[PDB]
Design a binder for this molecule. Structure first.
Ligand SMILES: C#Cc1oc2ccc(C)cc2c1CC(=O)O
Ligand SMILES: C#Cc1oc2ccc(C)cc2c1CC(=O)O
Lengths: 138, 138
């Protein structure tokens, strides 16, 4: 149930990125402007899909949102400070698709798709999408 | 990889619902007004998360959207006509939470959460969320 949440920026829009740490599986979303509400909405969606026990963030923003607090509590997500390359390689894949899409969000989702379905170096072993299912099945 | 897509309506807003047929797992989203684009966006998101091989719909709307067609083709989703209670029991769970939320979409996601994490009749056996992971792990 361990995730990292961070955010990243492109064409002046904010991309929320959750990583399932043991798998490298990602979910992402383009949000209107870093709000408590939208982070809360993304958390509640993610927790309804996967076991989400602990979310690790690297700064204080998410500790100051009333709605994130209520989402955390509603869904039983521990907020934990501290995070003991992803953003970067998702952007490479976004640039290779960017023109195949009117909306930035469609390119973000095409990039999430490829990241989660790819095999590491293109052959053999498991996708991030397969590893997350394999870890939760065990 | 078999899903059903349908849509439903509440407080004058449209809720897109995908069901993984063997599991009963659901994903849902509140969209602005039944567009090709937003259905396409929802499909591309879903396929990046789960194996999505075939989507079954019960009418023609999704066969007339250029963007749905391109999403289908990009992600390798077969669109199939014909669907050989869900909407209804999701609405019961929405009514029990509706007041716990400013936005309808938050109540939809609280209802998706409970539907996917619940056990059938409250004890024993597996949640829809556990069955989808168990079916794909096998
Ligand atoms: C947008 C948004 C949003 O997402 C959430 C997730 C969990 C909880 C308890 C609350 C919210 C809200 C605000 C609300 O609708 O009450
Ligand atoms: C909104 C939206 C949207 O979602 C998609 C999913 C797959 C594909 C090929 C295209 C789109 C678009 C339109 C676009 O951004 O080109």
């Amino acid at each position: 149930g361990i995730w990292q949440l961070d955010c990243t920026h492109l064409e002046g829009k904010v991309i929320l990125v959750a990583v399932h740490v043991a798998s490298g599986y990602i979910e992402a979303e383009v949000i209107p402007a870093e709000t408590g509400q939208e982070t809360a909405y993304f958390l509640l969606k993610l927790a309804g899909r996967w076991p989400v026990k602990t979310v690790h963030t690297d700064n204080g923003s998410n500790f100051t949102s009333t709605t994130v607090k209520a989402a955390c509590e509603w869904a039983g997500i521990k907020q934990e400070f501290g995070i003991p390359s992803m953003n970067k390689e998702l952007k490479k894949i976004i640039g290779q698709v960017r023109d195949q899409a009117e909306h930035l969000k469609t390119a973000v989702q095409m990039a999430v798709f490829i990241h989660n379905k790819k095999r590491k170096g293109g052959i053999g072993g498991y996708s991030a999408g397969e590893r997350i299912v394999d870890i939760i099945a065990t």
